[PDB]
Amino acid sequence: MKTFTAKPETVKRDWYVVDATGKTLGRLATELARRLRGKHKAEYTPHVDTGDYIIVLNADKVAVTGNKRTDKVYYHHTGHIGGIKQATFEEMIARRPERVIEIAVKGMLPKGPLGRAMFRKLKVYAGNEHNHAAQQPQVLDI
Amino acid sequence: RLNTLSPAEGSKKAGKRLGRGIGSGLGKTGGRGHKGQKSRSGGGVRR
Amino acid sequence: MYAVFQSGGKQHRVSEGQTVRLEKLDIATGETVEFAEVLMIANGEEVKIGVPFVDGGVIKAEVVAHGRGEKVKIVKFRRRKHYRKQQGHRQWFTDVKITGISA
Amino acid sequence: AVQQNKPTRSKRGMRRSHDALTAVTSLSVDKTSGEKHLRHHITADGYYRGRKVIAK
Amino acid sequence: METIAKHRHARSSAQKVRLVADLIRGKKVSQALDILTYTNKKAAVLVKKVLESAIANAEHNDGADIDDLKVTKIFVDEGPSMKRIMPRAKGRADRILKRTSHITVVVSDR
Amino acid sequence: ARVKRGVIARARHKKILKQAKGYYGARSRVYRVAFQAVIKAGQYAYRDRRQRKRQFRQLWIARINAAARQNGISYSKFINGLKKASVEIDRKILADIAVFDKVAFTALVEKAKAALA
Amino acid sequence: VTGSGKKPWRQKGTGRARSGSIKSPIWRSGGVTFAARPQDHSQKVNKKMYRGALKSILSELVRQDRLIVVEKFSVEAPKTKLLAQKLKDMALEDVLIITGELDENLFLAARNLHKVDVRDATGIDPVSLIAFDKVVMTADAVKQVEEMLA
Amino acid sequence: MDINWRHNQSTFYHFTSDHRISGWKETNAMYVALNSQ
RNA sequence: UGUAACGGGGCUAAACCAUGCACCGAAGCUGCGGCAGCGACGCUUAUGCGUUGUUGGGUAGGGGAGCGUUCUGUAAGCCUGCGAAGGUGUGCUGUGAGGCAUGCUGGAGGUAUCAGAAGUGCGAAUGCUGACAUAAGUAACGAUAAAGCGGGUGAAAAGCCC
RNA sequence: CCCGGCGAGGGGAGUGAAAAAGAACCUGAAACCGUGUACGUACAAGCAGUGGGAGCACGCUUAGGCGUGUGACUGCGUACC
Numbered sequence A: 001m002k003t004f005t006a007k008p009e010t011v012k013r014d015w016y017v018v019d020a021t022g023k024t025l026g027r028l029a030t031e032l033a034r035r036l037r038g039k040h041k042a043e044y045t046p047h048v049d050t051g052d053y054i055i056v057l058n059a060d061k062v063a064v065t066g067n068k069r070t071d072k073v074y075y076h077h078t079g080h081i082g083g084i085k086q087a088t089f090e091e092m093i094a095r096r097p098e099r100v101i102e103i104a105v106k107g108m109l110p111k112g113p114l115g116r117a118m119f120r121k122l123k124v125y126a127g128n129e130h131n132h133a134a135q136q137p138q139v140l141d142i
Numbered sequence B: 001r002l003n004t005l006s007p008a009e010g011s012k013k014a015g016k017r018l019g020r021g022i023g024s025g026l027g028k029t030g031g032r033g034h035k036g037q038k039s040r041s042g043g044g045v046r047r
Numbered sequence C: 001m002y003a004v005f006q007s008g009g010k011q012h013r014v015s016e017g018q019t020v021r022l023e024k025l026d027i028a029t030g031e032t033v034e035f036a037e038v039l040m041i042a043n044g045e046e047v048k049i050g051v052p053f054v055d056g057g058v059i060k061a062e063v064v065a066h067g068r069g070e071k072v073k074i075v076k077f078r079r080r081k082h083y084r085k086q087q088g089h090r091q092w093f094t095d096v097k098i099t100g101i102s103a
Numbered sequence D: 001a002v003q004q005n006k007p008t009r010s011k012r013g014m015r016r017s018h019d020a021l022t023a024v025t026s027l028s029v030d031k032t033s034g035e036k037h038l039r040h041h042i043t044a045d046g047y048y049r050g051r052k053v054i055a056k
Numbered sequence E: 001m002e003t004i005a006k007h008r009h010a011r012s013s014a015q016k017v018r019l020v021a022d023l024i025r026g027k028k029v030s031q032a033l034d035i036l037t038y039t040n041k042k043a044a045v046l047v048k049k050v051l052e053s054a055i056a057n058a059e060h061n062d063g064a065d066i067d068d069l070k071v072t073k074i075f076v077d078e079g080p081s082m083k084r085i086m087p088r089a090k091g092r093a094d095r096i097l098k099r100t101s102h103i104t105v106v107v108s109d110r
Numbered sequence F: 001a002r003v004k005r006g007v008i009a010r011a012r013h014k015k016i017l018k019q020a021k022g023y024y025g026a027r028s029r030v031y032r033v034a035f036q037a038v039i040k041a042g043q044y045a046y047r048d049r050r051q052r053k054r055q056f057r058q059l060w061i062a063r064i065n066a067a068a069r070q071n072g073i074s075y076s077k078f079i080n081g082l083k084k085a086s087v088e089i090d091r092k093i094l095a096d097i098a099v100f101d102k103v104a105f106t107a108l109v110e111k112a113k114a115a116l117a
Numbered sequence G: 001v002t003g004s005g006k007k008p009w010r011q012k013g014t015g016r017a018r019s020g021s022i023k024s025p026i027w028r029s030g031g032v033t034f035a036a037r038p039q040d041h042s043q044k045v046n047k048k049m050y051r052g053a054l055k056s057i058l059s060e061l062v063r064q065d066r067l068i069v070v071e072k073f074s075v076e077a078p079k080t081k082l083l084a085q086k087l088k089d090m091a092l093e094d095v096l097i098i099t100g101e102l103d104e105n106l107f108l109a110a111r112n113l114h115k116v117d118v119r120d121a122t123g124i125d126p127v128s129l130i131a132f133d134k135v136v137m138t139a140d141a142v143k144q145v146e147e148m149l150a
Numbered sequence H: 001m002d003i004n005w006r007h008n009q010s011t012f013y014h015f016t017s018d019h020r021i022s023g024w025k026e027t028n029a030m031y032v033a034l035n036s037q
Numbered sequence I: 001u002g003u004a005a006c007g008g009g010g011c012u013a014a015a016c017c018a019u020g021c022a023c024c025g026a027a028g029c030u031g032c033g034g035c036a037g038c039g040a041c042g043c044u045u046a047u048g049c050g051u052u053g054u055u056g057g058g059u060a061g062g063g064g065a066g067c068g069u070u071c072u073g074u075a076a077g078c079c080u081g082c083g084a085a086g087g088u089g090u091g092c093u094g095u096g097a098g099g100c101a102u103g104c105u106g107g108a109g110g111u112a113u114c115a116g117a118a119g120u121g122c123g124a125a126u127g128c129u130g131a132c133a134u135a136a137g138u139a140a141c142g143a144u145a146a147a148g149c150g151g152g153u154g155a156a157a158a159g160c161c162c
Numbered sequence J: 001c002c003c004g005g006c007g008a009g010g011g012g013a014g015u016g017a018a019a020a021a022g023a024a025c026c027u028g029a030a031a032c033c034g035u036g037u038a039c040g041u042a043c044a045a046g047c048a049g050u051g052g053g054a055g056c057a058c059g060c061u062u063a064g065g066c067g068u069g070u071g072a073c074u075g076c077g078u079a080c081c
Helices: A025-037 A089-095 A098-108 A113-119 D009-018 E014-024 E029-037 E043-061 F006-018 F031-070 F075-084 F091-100 F102-116 G047-063 G080-089 G104-109 G126-131 G139-148 H002-007 H029-036
Strands: A015-019 A053-057 A073-077 A084-088 A122-124 C002-006 C011-014 C019-023 C032-035 C038-042 C046-048 C058-068 C072-078 C083-089 C092-102 E003-010 E070-078 E082-087 E093-098 E101-108 G067-070 G095-099 G116-120 G134-138
Touching: A015 A025, A025 A053, A025 A098, A025 A113, A073 A089, A084 A089, A089 A098, A098 A113, A098 A122, C011 C019, C011 F091, C038 F091, C038 F102, C046 F102, C072 F031, E003 E043, E014 E029, E014 E043, E014 E070, E014 E101, E029 E043, E029 E070, E043 E101, E082 H002, E093 H002, F006 F031, F031 F075, F031 F091, F031 F102, F075 F102, F091 F102, G047 G067, G047 G126, G067 G139, G080 G104, G095 G126, G095 G139, G134 G139
Parallel strands: A015 A053, A053 A122, G067 G134, G095 G116, G095 G134
Antiparallel strands: A073 A084, C002 C011, C002 C038, C019 C092, C032 C058, C038 C046, C058 C092, C072 C083, E003 E101, E070 E101, E082 E093
16 A cells, blocks of 8 residues: 555644743744644645644743844845845844744745745744634643 | 578677667767777778 | 555555555465464554564465556666666566455 | 747747737717717718718 | 638738637627727738628528627638748848738537 | 668657657657656656655654654654564554554554563 | 769858768768669579588478479470469479470470479579479489489 | 749858958957957 | 855754764665576586576676668568558557557558568757748838828729829 | 629539548648647746645546546756767
């Protein structure tokens, strides 16, 4: 016979809420990337989005070690020529902290159409409450 | 019985045909290597 | 109730009445074989192997059809060095049908 | 100044996706003669807005 | 019942005709004639003559009733090119492909 | 004896172009490009008869690693356990049990933890 | 090839490939590369190999019962009807009659029959002993054949 | 037309002009070569 | 040109050092199935097998064995208007070049087997010839002396005639 | 006979065994250009395949879970001489 393949019409996938207070950024990020791929499920299939929907909250309260609070620099280029634009970690936490968790997880997820579809399942909030009470996210303690 | 006569075994050897394909063994350069005076038509030195 | 057994080179997880395509066995077409080297029997209670192959288990399988599989082309081209070699291959198989699994 | 790979027939039809002609889209019916004409134009019999004009 | 008219060897390239053919494809016939009367192309004259010929072949050689007919198929094949010569500068010549086409209108009531 | 070569050349070209149906553009129309496409497809097909064995194995390992961590042990410790428990089930079958029969996989994890302790 | 040795374009500067003659074998209308000449296809057969070959084929015509030895074989009048009836009576259709003295009437009687060929004992060849189904030798032809083949 | 096309392809086959590429095409190749020296 | 000297995320260990036990990891080795070469060996003896060992990446190049094409003999035979060659599909088959059967088109030739001879196999030569694309419905429509209107002819008039 | 400009071209009728044998005439390939249908394709980067592979559409098929077409998504992959 043939190896089982998950079918994306019939993938059941759950909702999880994770409190990101005082977690380390990379270690949380790597756990979220694992859950959004669907690597924790026995029906994992590399071309099917099998993962779960995670609601990260308290994104502004995430922690980093060392002097990464001030020395970790987020560069991006704008397309216009001298457009190299940097922003440290504390400037990002002040401006938009959702971008901190989302940049991390996005760089841990496979690049391509599927990993974009995998990132659409991450919902990050800078506060303590979310609109998604209808989906009943159970508390993923990680 | 003129369609049952047949030569000896080993008497008619094939004949090298050079220049036909990759499988045949003698294609492209026909067995005469890369450039030089010897790989040239008419090419060769005297006795 | 399924059963995992070892066969020619590799392993097969098979229920009863299921046709399996194995490697070429040296058996006649309607003849019945037995695999005495079953590695798992699960019905609603698992039975598997501390020391391997289960002590009381055997699979009786009736041979259905010897055959020769789909042709595959084997292509060996070395770019730019005047070498290519094509070849073909049809693997022999043996379809058996699982008559019964005895735990 | 000249191409460097021959363009496909794909890219050729993509360029011609806009070369389509638009239909008329509906042409209007005269008041008196009851015949059809482009709007704001005179008819083939030479009427316009229900009165007789040209008459050649 | 399908009824055909063709203009073989029409002096207009098939591209230029296919614009007009793409207008009237699928229409009822009186509507197609009203489109070709007010399209300002040379190809609309050619296509209109083939369409009028197909309505006439339908009503005369087959069953009548113009008002039920529809332009089911219309297509413009390419015909043979007339190979001529344009004298260019510095003594060089070109081939001009004076292109023809083959207009086909299949009209039908069903 | 002049030999015209139209009919046999047509047959070879046609053989190659039938092996290139479905390719984009000239790759399915023009002989001179369909020959290269057909060969490069041959080389890839060879290469990938080896890679499918590698790819399936890494898929199975990821599924046994998922289901085994669902039962509280890693893949590394699980395979060590079953080898010490002298279980010889290959990992196609462990992946397939790990999908279809969760209870049998639970019992295999119990043999692995039993021998591994 | 009927042309001229004028070079069709200048050696350099046209973007054409370089060419030197309009009679090149790569050009249409151009002259075969290794054009044939009238040639002789005769092989030497050694005399003892020719005689050896005749001895082998005669021995196999005897061994396969394709060799019929009659005492006399002559026709009454030069008519193909008479030879057709005579060969019909002897159960022979495809036949090589070989006679030590070439009869005129037999020769004229076999000249229209397709399968039938009359030879003198002198002029037999390997391809006819092998070609025809039955060979009918006159006894005189047998003696002359043994004198030829020693 | 075919005869005129064969002869009018045969126009610059035996040329001499060196400043014009292929007998006819204008260029700057005199300055390119001359500057390379 | 842009982070831009960890591949990247990210890491205070996911760094380094020391020890240890796991696991991943190749076309390596093993398992199962198949083919071929060279030895050895008991028969079979003009060779195949119960075997058996071992080998099989390959350019220039050497050696061996084949397939197809056209033509001659076999052939005044054998296929063929109940339908040939050719063309275009499908199915089966051989390690391969290939082979075989058959639907549709075609409309009169084809040729087993075993030999014989080669204008005997093309993707390249800024190859030769024909056809057809591409740019592309693009530049241009050949003096910047200049046209406007009425009428006629016509299926149709900026251009013809008045 | 009909459309058409007493055209070109065509549609019928008729001859013909056959006029997609109609004089642009035996066969009628390929490039190239179309029309129709099934599938895919408008948030996605690259020798355009290949290994895996969902879904959909046609045929089956005593549902046997196959075959053909397409091919989302995914690993690997920089043409030939």
